[PDB]
């Protein structure tokens, strides 16, 4: 069915159907389709799921000139945990990556790949499994209850990387950006966002060190942005992004109670402007909403208002863009983009709408999402999505 009580609101005399261009790629439009694990991949091996992708991706791509960012990558086997979700390591999988970038391309949009590293979100057991660390910044806190009895069942104890093992992430980061381009991807953005490795470093809470990772404002960026010039140096600027979430406390993150969050980020930004002076700039800049704290809250919950991702537009000059509820709310979005260098992630809306382009452009009616496929082993909720002409002829409501 149609999202009940919503009234849509055309917004093609916006911005956001205005082209710009990203890295190297020229959109016709700025709704982009976030990053979206499904977990819909195969085990073992963590090989793409080779029955669904193309379709999937093909589905989302049909609108000309869309910028799609994937779901979360594993860089390793180390960087993972959950047994079905993608890796980008392996022969095996880059062979059915590179058929989905071909469908992708082939409809004429573009697919920038998200590296993923999780850290303490990953299940302490997988790993055990496989004999893998149950990494993490720290090792005197952890993310929650749950995640301590796991980790303690499987004896498999939070792990705090020595200065070594961080270089070796750093090593698997280049070489999962290079098969990713090699793979014919147009770019990846390094996820320093929603509580995985990287923003655990990042963050205050979950990291407690006292070495040159840990301890200040420039030591907790150091990790996000090695990884940063290191890909850059590795596969040019243009072809990398870097998400961040400020005010995000999903997975055990501060978020605004923390007093130094802001200028924990703006630091982070002022370098990555630093470098775009030096003529390096990154192709983006990906903020996670304060409107959305928690992805698994419905619409309207977890929502802050005592801070606002405005402060990055004062020290980064390049596009952002900018997720987090934005689909029922137009009237929002239309201010947003007001701002010539804005682009709209639309997350959830774009899983049971696989033309949500086209329904935003003309303010055509939205199907509403199931959120119990959003990780199940199935097709449904998964390519069963009907456009809004499937969704007529099936009669809902408007036969
Ligand atoms: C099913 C699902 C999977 C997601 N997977 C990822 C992911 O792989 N990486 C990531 O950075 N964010 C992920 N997100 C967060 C989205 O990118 C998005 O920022 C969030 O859903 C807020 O946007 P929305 O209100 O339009 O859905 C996910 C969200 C959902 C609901």
């Given at each position: 069915s149609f999202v009940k009580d919503f009234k849509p609101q055309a917004l093609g005399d916006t911005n956001l159907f205005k082209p710009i261009k990203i890295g190297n790629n020229e959109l016709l439009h700025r709704a982009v389709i976030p990053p979206l694990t499904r977990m819909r991949a195969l085990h073992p091996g963590n090989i793409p799921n080779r029955d669904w992708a193309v379709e999937y991706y093909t589905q989302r791509a049909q609108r000309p000139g869309t910028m799609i960012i994937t779901e979360?990558?594993?860089?390793s086997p180390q960087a993972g945990g959950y047994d079905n979700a993608p890796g980008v390591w392996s022969e095996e999988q880059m062979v059915e990556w590179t058929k989905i970038f071909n469908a992708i391309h082939e409809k004429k949009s573009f697919v920038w790949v998200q590296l993923w590293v999780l850290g303490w979100a990953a299940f302490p057991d997988n790993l055990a499994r496989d004999g893998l660390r149950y990494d993490s910044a720290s090792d005197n806190v952890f993310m929650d209850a749950e995640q301590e009895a796991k980790a303690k069942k499987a004896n498999n104890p939070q792990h705090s990387l020595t200065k070594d093992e961080i270089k070796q992430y750093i090593k698997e980061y280049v070489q999962a950006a290079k098969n990713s381009i090699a793979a014919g991807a147009d770019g990846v953005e390094?996820?320093?966002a929603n509580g995985y490795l990287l923003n655990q470093f990042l963050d205050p809470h979950s990291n407690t060190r006292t070495d040159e990772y840990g301890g200040s404002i420039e030591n907790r960026a150091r990790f996000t942005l090695e990884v940063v010039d290191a890909l850059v140096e590795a596969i040019g600027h243009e072809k990398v992004g870097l998400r961040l979430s400020p005010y995000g406390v999903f997975n055990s993150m501060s978020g605004g109670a923390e007093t130094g969050i802001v200028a924990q980020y703006a630091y982070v930004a002022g370098e990555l402007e630093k470098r775009a002076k030096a003529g390096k700039r990154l192709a983006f800049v990906h903020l996670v909403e304060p409107r959305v704290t928690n992805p698994f809250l419905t619409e309207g919950e977890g929502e802050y208002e005592g801070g606002?991702?405005?402060?990055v537009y004062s020290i980064w000059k390049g596009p952002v863009i900018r997720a987090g509820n934005f689909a029922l709310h137009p009237e929002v979005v239309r201010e947003e983009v007001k701002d010539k260098r804005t682009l709209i992630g639309y997350?959830?809306?774009?899983?049971?709408?696989?033309?949500?382009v086209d329904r935003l452009e003309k303010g055509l009616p939205l199907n509403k999402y199931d959120r119990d496929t959003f990780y199940q082993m199935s097709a449904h909720g998964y390519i069963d999505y009907p456009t809004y002409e499937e969704a007529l002829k099936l009669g809902w409501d408007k036969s």
């Open positions: 979360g990558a594993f860089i390094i996820n320093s606002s991702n405005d402060f997350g959830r809306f774009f899983i049971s709408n696989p033309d949500l």
